[PDB]
RNA sequence: GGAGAUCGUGAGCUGGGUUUAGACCGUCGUGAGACAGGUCGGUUACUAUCUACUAGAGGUGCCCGAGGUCUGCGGGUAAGC
RNA sequence: CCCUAACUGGAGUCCGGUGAAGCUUACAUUCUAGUGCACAGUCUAGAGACCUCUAGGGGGAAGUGAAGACCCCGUGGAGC
RNA sequence: UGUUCGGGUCGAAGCAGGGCUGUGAAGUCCUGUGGACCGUUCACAAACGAAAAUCCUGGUAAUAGUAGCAGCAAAGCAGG
RNA sequence: AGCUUGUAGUCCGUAAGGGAGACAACCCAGCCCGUGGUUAAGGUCCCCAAGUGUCGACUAAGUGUUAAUACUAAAGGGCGU
RNA sequence: CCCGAGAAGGGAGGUGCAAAGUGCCUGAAACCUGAUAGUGAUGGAACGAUACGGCAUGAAAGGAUCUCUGGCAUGAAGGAAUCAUUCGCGAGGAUGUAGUACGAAUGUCACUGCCAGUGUCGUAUCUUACGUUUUGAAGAACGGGCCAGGGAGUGUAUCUU
């Protein structure tokens, strides 16, 4: 047979395409530190999309300097509380949690997620982790953070989302001392990400239910006379005669959307503190208006409105320092027109 | 066709039995409802069956699972056997009445035996295609039910 | 407790398999990454990369990557592990890379006949290097 | 590029050709009829039991009882060319 | 058709009632290779596999329908 | 069937399970149910022994509480 | 040609048990039942009962770890040893 | 008499030696429902044969020098261990100890109350069902969904032994 060649329908890189096991995206890897101590991650909630007219500053671009309209995505990012400081012991098997110390003072809203840890072993847990770091059992220190969505009116929930955010420093003693400084406090997103720097956005994408193979893998609809013979949105064949089994690589129906996905090199364009700077007339559609401090991310982001978005500094950022942007116009006209 | 000897005999001192003689209900769903209500008290079983008929509580279908989705709460596939619930409710009411007539207390009776038996089948026909008539039956069910104030 | 430093993989595996089929002792095999495999390095890596990328993803042999799990797999091969005798023998066997914390200060016994200096050539590679070249972290 | 997968793939499709019943042309045969010759026309049956795969759940197994955050034995990728 | 999308009504999905039929020696959670009448879920050697349920379209069961209508044979027929 | 010797409402045949004997065909015994007939010696007869014929008649499954109860005229709601 | 057609012997058909991974006809073996013993074929590192057996060499290729065989690649070459 | 809307049906109750309780004598299996025993959500398949164990049963019809555990006597085939000598490069062999101690079974004396058997499960070895067509069948060759009953060398005439 003179074979006609087509690339495989869909990607096997994201299988098994199942429902993600949490509403919070999780980071499997963290970038190596390149400077002063700081949290490597922040968490916000996606409000919606608008567009800005920013002067182009991207070096070597065709349209450098001239006006462009960049679709941005406003993200509502209030302060987060660094709840716990957790140290890990590395061995042949892998990293293992060796000890934790929780902050003495914590928000009352945390009870809806977990029962409130008492203000007990604060100095003694810290000295135990210090001794563990001194003897050499400790390899890395991470901070536990939660959002405080009680302020946000567009997000219906008031329970925090707890997640781990690695500290970015050089020496494990340095990481421990910075974590001691920031433990139990509220750190705004300006203390993590700077204006104009790339990040990575992870979030559980928009669930689309149990979708078919034509939408799930983009397979071909039956064409011509075959379009009306009884199988239009069905895959043509599930396998050969041998091997006598359906492969896992055949397109088929199943859970589409609501997967965890990571987007690289999502630039930050603005670090705002008043929601009236970006909230359009009539508010956002199905959200409301912005009431906290926000960040404007260039381009799209996985997930719908109100979804938790995890922001970390980039892990494969090709480009150098990009500088501050020059926004000429944040388009706050109505999204409903 | 006629009267049925009981599969199980509780002791006649503390026994209040009642037979649902050849009901025209679904034997599979009635069997599941009988499996559920065995071991419960008469009052709680009546309350559960009333909730079943009102579509608030579902019986768990574990043996005849096909054509039944998964119900809410901590449950596998389950349904709402309205007709089986009504017939087993009538048998439960008759058992409580027999317990009253025997001087026994229906308010403490525990259903120690509650099973179904398929009765005689009324043979029917269904006019199919190509000049053929397949059967379609009115399957009858004998519903036994024994109470007792001992457990 | 068997110290598998400088021991042939198959001879150690056969000895431990017969010992476990005697049927009383829990056998810990520390330093599993330092076991020896005779033959040239190219042939050893070729066989182990062929065996690593063999099966299907739904059915096929998920041959391990860790050195301790590879040594456990090799001892698993020389047992009737689908039987109750083999299942008990594999439950009574533990293989570790390096020295775990509970085996510090413990007493070890090494097989005389499974020694690597009985071989008469330089053609060998350690099991740790084969695991590392299979992509393992240990 | 070529080739394999029952010349992969009709309980997926199509039905164009070949391989039914009708008819025409040419050539054979006294004839009925025939042609590894051509031409026109010509019915695609089934409610999926088991298994395999794709997704979604309920249990037990492990386990102070529960919750939360993680690790990584492994599996997958072309995630780019 | 490139290249599919959205929407409408009926099915399907879920629920209440009613309610058949067709395949079926047995067992059966399989996958690879060999062997075997040379096309194996059951043999041999390995590899995997906790069970149950729901939806899905049909890879396999040389799936079911059916004493092959093609070819041959019959000191079997019929028509011409 | 002829003929010899018999058993049975103080419970025959048959039916479900079990002990014993026999290489085995099978026989005998015990437990339960049953409500009227049943064997044996020596010989003789046959409408005389089933696991199978896409066997025949009857009963009954799995499929399955599944398909159908939709397509050509989508028809019902409030009060009593 | 695991093709077709003969001839001599022995087999399967009609042949158990033991062993070759499985093997109609290849080896031991022709076999009434139970027990004990020792051997046949073949094997003794583990899977698996018994040798990490002895002596003298060879092979560095995972070659090989395959009596017979429908189940096992040649010609040619090698300052490989 | 009670429940039930009920001339349905059910319970209580009675007739009857016996419900045999209106196609009603006995009342099989297939099939279905429940209970008991064993096992069971780490698990490999002709469902079984043989041996050994766990759990449950073992009232009758089966054993009572029968079941369990030992001593003593006679013990066929076979036959050590240990030690000594000598040989062998060595693994080992030969000789003696020794045809000794042992050894299937046949008797006898103590000792004990279970054993044979039945159901299910596990462990070890062996077996890819039955009939048929076949040189060759577990066949991806044909027949059977399951159970019950029916279902195939008979008579006349003649010839031969
Ligand atoms: Mg009905
Ligand atoms: Mg008609
Ligand atoms: Mg097909
Ligand atoms: Mg034919
Ligand atoms: Mg002829
Ligand atoms: Mg029959
Ligand atoms: Mg409808
Ligand atoms: Mg021969
Ligand atoms: Mg012969
Ligand atoms: Mg043989
Ligand atoms: Mg023959
Ligand atoms: Mg018969």
């Amino acid at each position: 047979m003179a074979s006609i060649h087509r690339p495989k329908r869909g990607s096997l890189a994201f299988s098994p395409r199942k429902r993600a096991k949490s509403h919070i995206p999780r980071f499997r890897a963290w970038p190596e530190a390149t400077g002063e101590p700081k949290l490597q991650s922040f968490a916000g909630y996606k409000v919606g999309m608008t567009h800005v007219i920013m002067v182009d500053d991207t070096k070597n671009s065709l349209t450098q300097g001239m006006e462009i309209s960049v679709p941005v995505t406003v993200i509502e990012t209030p302060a987060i509380r660094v709840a716990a400081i957790r140290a890990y012991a590395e061995d042949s098997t892998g990293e293992k949690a060796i000890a934790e110390v929780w902050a003495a003072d914590l928000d009352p809203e945390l009870k809806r997620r977990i029962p409130i840890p008492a203000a007990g072993n604060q100095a003694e847990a810290l000295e135990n982790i210090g001794k563990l770091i001194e003897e050499g059992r400790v390899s890395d220190v991470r901070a536990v953070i939660y959002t405080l969505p009680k302020s946000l009116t567009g997000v219906p929930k008031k329970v925090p989302d707890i997640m781990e955010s690695g500290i970015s420093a050089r020496d494990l003693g340095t990481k421990f001392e910075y974590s001691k400084t920031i433990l139990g406090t509220l750190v705004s997103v300006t203390d993590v990400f700077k204006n104009g720097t790339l990040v990575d956005t992870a979030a559980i994408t928009i669930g689309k239910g149990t979708q078919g193979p034509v939408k799930r893998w983009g397979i071909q609809l039956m064409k011509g006379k075959h379009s009306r013979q009884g199988s239009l949105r069905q895959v043509g064949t599930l396998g050969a005669f041998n091997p006598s089994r359906v492969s896992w690589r055949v397109p088929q129906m199943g859970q589409m959307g609501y997967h965890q996905r990571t987007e690289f090199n999502k630039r930050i364009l603005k670090i705002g503190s008043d929601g009236e700077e970006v909230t359009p007339e009539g508010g956002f559609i199905n959200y409301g208006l912005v009431r906290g401090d926000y960040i404007l991310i260039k381009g799209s982001v996985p997930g719908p409105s109100k979804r938790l978005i995890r922001l970390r500094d980039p892990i494969r950022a090709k480009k150098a320092d990009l500088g501050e942007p020059n926004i000429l116009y944040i388009s706050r006209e109505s999204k409903q027109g | 066709m006629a009267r049925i000897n009981y599969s199980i005999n509780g002791d006649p001192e503390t026994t209040s039995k009642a037979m649902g003689s050849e009901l025209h209900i679904s034997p599979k769903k009635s069997r599941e409802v009988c499996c559920k209500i065995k071991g419960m008290k008469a009052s709680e079983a009546r309350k559960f069956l009333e909730d079943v008929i009102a579509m608030k509580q579902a019986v768990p279908f574990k043996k005849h699972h096909d054509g039944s989705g998964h119900r809410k709460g901590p449950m596998a596939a389950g349904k709402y056997p309205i007709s089986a619930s009504k017939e087993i409710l009538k048998v439960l009411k008759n058992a409580e009445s027999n317990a009253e007539y025997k001087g026994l207390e229906p308010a403490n009776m525990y259903i120690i035996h509650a099973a179904i038996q398929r009765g005689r089948v009324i043979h029917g026909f269904m006019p199919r295609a190509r000049g053929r008539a397949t059967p379609k039956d009115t399957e009858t069910v004998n519903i036994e039910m024994i109470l007792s104030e001992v457990r | 407790v068997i110290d598998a430093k400088g021991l042939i993989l198959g001879r150690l595996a056969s000895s431990v398999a017969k010992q476990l089929l005697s049927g009383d002792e829990k056998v810990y095999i520390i330093n599993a990454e330092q076991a020896i495999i005779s033959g040239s390095r190219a042939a050893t890596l070729r066989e182990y990369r062929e065996t690593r990328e063999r099966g299907a993803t739904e059915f096929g042999p998920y041959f391990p990557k860790r050195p301790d799990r590879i040594l456990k797999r090799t001892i698993r091969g020389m047992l009737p592990y689908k039987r109750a005798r083999g299942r008990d023998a594999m439950s009574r066997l533990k293989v570790y890379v390096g020295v775990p914390y509970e085996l510090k200060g413990a007493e070890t016994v090494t097989i005389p006949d499974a020694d690597m200096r009985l071989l008469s050539s330089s053609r060998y590679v350690e099991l740790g290097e084969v695991s590392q070249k299979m992509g393992s972290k240990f």
Side-chain angles (χ1 to χ4, degrees):
Chain A
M1 48 193 172
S3 52
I4 300 292
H5 310 86
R6 179 66 174 70
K8 199 267 172 192
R9 296 292 187 162
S11 167
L12 296 191
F14 304 94
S15 293
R17 301 196 178 190
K18 43 182 294 307
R19 291 184 190 163
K21 76 174 178 183
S22 174
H23 56 279
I24 311 176
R26 309 299 184 173
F27 286 128
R28 269 59 161 263
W30 304 88
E32 281 282 17
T34 318
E36 294 292 359
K38 92 170 188 63
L39 274 167
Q40 305 195 258
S41 165
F42 208 83
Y45 297 89
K46 176 184 174 175
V47 164
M49 289 194 61
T50 56
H51 65 270
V52 302
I53 304 285
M54 70 172 294
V55 176
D56 185 23
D57 64 336
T58 291
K59 167 191 44 186
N60 282 310
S61 56
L62 287 174
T63 60
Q64 173 177 343
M66 32 178 288
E67 304 298 327
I68 55 183
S69 183
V70 170
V72 305
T73 307
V74 56
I75 311 184
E76 203 158 354
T77 56
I80 64 174
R81 180 157 296 264
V82 175
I85 295 301
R86 180 200 291 248
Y88 283 96
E90 174 75 45
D91 69 83
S92 64
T93 57
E95 320 184 11
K96 299 181 182 309
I98 188 167
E100 320 168 13
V101 56
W102 273 74
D105 48 352
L106 289 177
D107 303 297
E109 73 175 1
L110 176 65
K111 173 203 175 305
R112 305 171 187 261
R113 176 66 67 204
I114 75 180
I116 323 297
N121 45 359
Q122 320 300 138
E124 49 267 21
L126 284 167
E127 74 174 329
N128 180 30
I129 296 184
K131 167 162 54 70
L132 300 180
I133 288 183
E134 201 271 348
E135 60 181 349
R137 289 174 55 178
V138 167
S139 65
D140 46 328
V141 182
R142 305 187 203 174
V144 170
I145 70 170
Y146 46 68
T147 55
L148 279 74
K150 66 190 182 310
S151 76
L152 310 192
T153 62
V155 178
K157 52 182 287 180
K158 289 171 284 182
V159 57
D161 282 329
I162 310 173
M163 57 206 78
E164 278 197 11
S165 162
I167 299 95
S168 171
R170 50 195 180 282
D171 163 62
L172 189 62
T174 302
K175 288 166 69 73
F176 173 58
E177 187 62 26
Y178 176 69
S179 58
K180 290 176 42 182
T181 62
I182 70 174
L183 159 66
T185 62
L186 291 194
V187 165
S188 310
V189 72
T190 312
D191 301 334
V192 179
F193 306 116
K194 295 203 171 313
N195 198 350
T197 78
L198 316 178
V199 288
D200 281 2
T201 64
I204 304 299
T205 47
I206 291 176
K208 293 185 181 175
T210 287
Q211 291 296 343
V214 172
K215 187 199 192 62
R216 206 185 168 198
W217 311 93
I219 61 172
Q220 174 169 173
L221 295 180
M222 284 307 185
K223 296 311 188 181
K225 176 162 295 203
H226 317 274
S227 56
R228 55 193 194 281
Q229 292 299 144
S231 292
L232 176 64
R233 315 187 50 91
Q234 303 169 354
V235 64
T237 310
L238 301 165
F241 206 95
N242 295 279
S244 314
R245 85 223 190 187
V246 180
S247 199
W248 75 284
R249 332 170 72 92
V250 182
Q252 269 169 327
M253 58 171 273
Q255 162 69 16
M256 187 175 174
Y258 205 68
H259 311 302
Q260 173 183 347
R261 299 295 196 245
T262 309
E263 295 281 321
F264 317 108
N265 306 348
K266 299 292 187 181
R267 195 181 178 185
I268 282 182
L269 293 178
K270 179 182 190 57
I271 297 284
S273 287
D274 191 88
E276 278 76 350
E277 313 156 11
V278 299
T279 290
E281 292 92 8
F284 282 97
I285 301 164
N286 275 99
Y287 189 80
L289 59 91
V290 192
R291 300 175 186 275
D293 57 356
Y294 61 95
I295 62 173
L296 282 164
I297 300 288
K298 166 179 173 174
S300 81
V301 170
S305 290
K306 313 170 186 183
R307 183 86 79 207
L308 182 62
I309 306 284
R310 292 221 59 180
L311 295 163
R312 78 181 178 188
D313 49 354
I315 200 172
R316 50 194 280 190
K318 289 171 36 182
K319 276 207 172 187
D321 182 24
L322 311 182
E324 290 268 337
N326 179 26
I327 310 312
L328 295 192
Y329 187 91
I330 306 181
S331 193
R332 50 187 280 165
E333 57 175 352
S334 163
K335 302 297 102 185
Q336 200 171 6
Chain B
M1 161 197 196
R3 55 99 187 181
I4 292 315
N5 277 259
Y6 282 79
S7 159
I8 299 171
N9 287 115
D11 64 329
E13 301 88 301
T14 74
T15 290
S16 180
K17 79 179 71 157
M19 171 83 62
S21 164
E22 285 206 335
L23 300 166
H24 297 286
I25 65 169
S26 186
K28 298 176 172 182
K29 312 186 179 312
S30 45
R31 192 262 204 197
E32 305 290 355
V33 181
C34 283
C35 282
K36 171 73 171 206
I37 72 176
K38 184 180 283 189
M40 309 174 43
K41 290 170 40 59
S43 51
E44 50 190 359
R46 171 176 288 276
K47 184 173 179 176
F48 164 69
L49 286 169
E50 294 281 20
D51 303 351
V52 169
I53 306 163
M55 309 277 168
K56 304 316 181 68
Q57 198 68 252
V59 300
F61 277 11
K62 290 186 302 175
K63 184 191 187 53
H64 303 282
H65 45 81
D66 208 320
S68 63
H70 286 198
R71 298 278 80 81
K72 276 179 64 69
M75 187 173 310
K79 309 296 271 289
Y80 313 94
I82 294 302
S83 301
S85 304
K86 300 189 179 182
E87 297 296 347
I88 303 168
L89 178 71
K90 289 177 71 64
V91 179
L92 182 73
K93 180 73 186 68
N94 190 287
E96 300 156 10
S97 293
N98 303 341
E100 300 166 16
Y101 192 86
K102 291 179 70 67
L104 309 155
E105 172 69 2
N108 310 328
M109 304 300 284
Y110 288 87
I111 298 170
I112 66 164
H113 175 43
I116 76 158
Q117 324 282 354
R118 283 172 157 95
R120 178 163 73 180
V121 160
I122 304 183
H123 296 276
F125 291 113
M126 180 188 327
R128 313 300 304 280
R130 305 256 177 69
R132 197 180 65 123
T134 71
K136 66 183 291 181
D137 289 357
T138 310
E139 304 167 355
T140 71
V141 178
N142 296 292
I143 293 296
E144 300 175 359
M145 184 173 287
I146 284 177
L147 301 169
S148 72
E149 69 180 13
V150 67
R151 262 195 66 182
Chain C
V1 175
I2 288 182
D3 193 1
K5 181 179 189 309
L7 297 165
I8 309 298
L9 176 63
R11 313 211 173 253
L12 159 76
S14 169
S15 165
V16 169
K18 200 39 179 186
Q19 190 160 356
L20 300 176
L21 288 177
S22 294
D24 278 326
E25 277 287 5
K26 296 167 294 183
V27 171
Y28 312 112
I29 302 184
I30 49 177
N31 317 280
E33 86 282 29
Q34 310 173 39
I36 311 298
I37 294 189
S38 64
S40 59
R41 164 178 283 94
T44 317
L45 299 186
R46 189 170 63 242
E47 281 185 346
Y48 272 99
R49 68 164 300 170
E50 286 185 358
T51 189
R52 165 84 186 114
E53 60 177 2
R54 181 166 261 123
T57 183
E58 283 310 324
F59 300 121
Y62 319 111
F63 192 85
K65 299 141 36 188
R66 284 187 57 96
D68 57 335
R69 279 179 42 74
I70 286 172
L71 198 151
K72 176 77 156 284
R73 175 68 161 258
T74 291
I75 306 184
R76 198 267 292 260
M78 317 168 175
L79 289 177
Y81 71 102
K82 301 270 171 52
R83 308 312 201 70
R85 190 179 66 141
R87 294 187 58 179
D88 169 50
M90 283 299 282
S91 57
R92 287 186 290 103
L93 165 58
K94 297 294 190 309
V95 182
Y96 310 96
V97 181
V99 178
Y101 194 64
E102 54 266 13
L103 293 176
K104 150 186 299 184
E107 277 312 320
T108 66
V109 290
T110 183
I111 303 97
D113 56 78
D115 199 5
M116 76 158 301
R117 71 190 54 100
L118 297 175
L119 295 197
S120 72
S121 77
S122 60
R123 315 190 86 181
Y124 66 97
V125 302
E126 287 190 355
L127 181 56
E129 164 193 24
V130 171
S131 299
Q132 206 268 329
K133 273 169 194 164
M134 262 184 281
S136 187
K137 189 183 319 303
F138 62 96

